[PDB]
């Protein structure tokens, strides 16, 4: 058993979505707390969200969350940053969401043809982004992002995480 402590006051949805997708593959416990800590082994912890995601994807090889080849792994690294830096800021949101829209235009999932850390990261980050929620409220969301966002949202794992952690 790997153990993930979470900030219960502000749940890391990306990490909780990853746990939901690897929990049949690796045994994981999730604990209530006030900060995010993945407890790997006695001298080994990860406290930043993107490292927590990467470790879970690496240890749950059957889940396929880090892609199937080097190019996909690289694309997933690109999106993990994109969410951490561009989608985590409210400055320049219009250009950022437009960029996401363009990448999604020919895609169903961000990378390859299956769910990956890129979807989990970008979706969770979007969900907590106030400018996104405003665009949705104003019926101004870009078509591809709206389509992709809604598709994930409807999925069972996402619904489950939402039920357990959404306020």
């Amino acid at each position: 058993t790997l153990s993930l402590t979470v900030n219960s006051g502000d749940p890391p949805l990306g990490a909780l979505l990853a746990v939901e997708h690897v929990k049949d593959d690796v045994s994981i416990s999730v604990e209530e707390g006030k900060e995010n800590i993945l407890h790997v082994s006695e001298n080994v912890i990860f406290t930043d969200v993107n490292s927590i995601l990467r470790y879970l994807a690496r240890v749950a090889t059957t889940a396929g969350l880090y892609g199937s080849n080097l190019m996909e792994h690289t694309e997933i690294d690109h999106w993990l940053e994109f969410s951490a830096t561009k989608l985590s800021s409210s400055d320049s949101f219009t250009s950022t969401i437009n960029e996401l829209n363009h990448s999604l235009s020919l895609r169903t999932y961000l990378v390859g043809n299956s769910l990956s850390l890129a979807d989990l990261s970008v979706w969770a980050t979007l969900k907590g982004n106030a400018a996104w929620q405003e665009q949705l409220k104003q019926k101004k969301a870009p078509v591809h992002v709206k389509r992709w966002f809604g598709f994930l949202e409807a999925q069972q794992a996402f619904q489950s995480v939402g039920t357990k952690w959404d306020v």
């Binding site: 490292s51 690496r58 080849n69 080097l70 690294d77 690109h78 994109f82």
Partner: protein, 204 residues
Amino acid sequence: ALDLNSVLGKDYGALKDIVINANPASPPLSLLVLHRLLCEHFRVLSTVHTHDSVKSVPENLLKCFDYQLGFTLIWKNVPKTQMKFSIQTMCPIEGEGNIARFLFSLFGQKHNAVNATLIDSWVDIAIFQLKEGSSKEKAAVFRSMNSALGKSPWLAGNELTVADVVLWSVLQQIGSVTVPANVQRWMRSCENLAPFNTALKLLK
């Protein structure tokens, strides 16, 4: 260690030639260092071009450089360093930290899940905390580095990794805070490597 072919896999041919777009006002030292590292290990055809986006690139930037890798750097007015590949089913890869991770992976060295993630974690610290960071945050990063570098010669262990390349490179391009002892030792161990000091003097 893994050969270049198996690393890239089915499209070794597709990925052998690499294109990077970089902004002359923000040259990516980490990539320059990694270019040097690659050249020591592989037969590399390198080229520099200048997109019409910009004018008057300084000479050092302009002169910054049967093969195994093609490596083309284009100066451009991009908001963020960007790598593109011939396959364009894929997205362009943004951010020197991400490009560096890919390039370092070409050496085919194996890491378990913990160590590979530790390496990634240090790159993120460089990109997300150090580079655009506060003075106070920088001191915290120094403390964390100092602790790790008291336990091994490199940030993630007994071998040099992309953690070292990126974090060292970013540190040069921000320029203040007291440097603790293990960090000082590590800094001079990095700068002692030809790929490192060579690339650094290019930027003069």
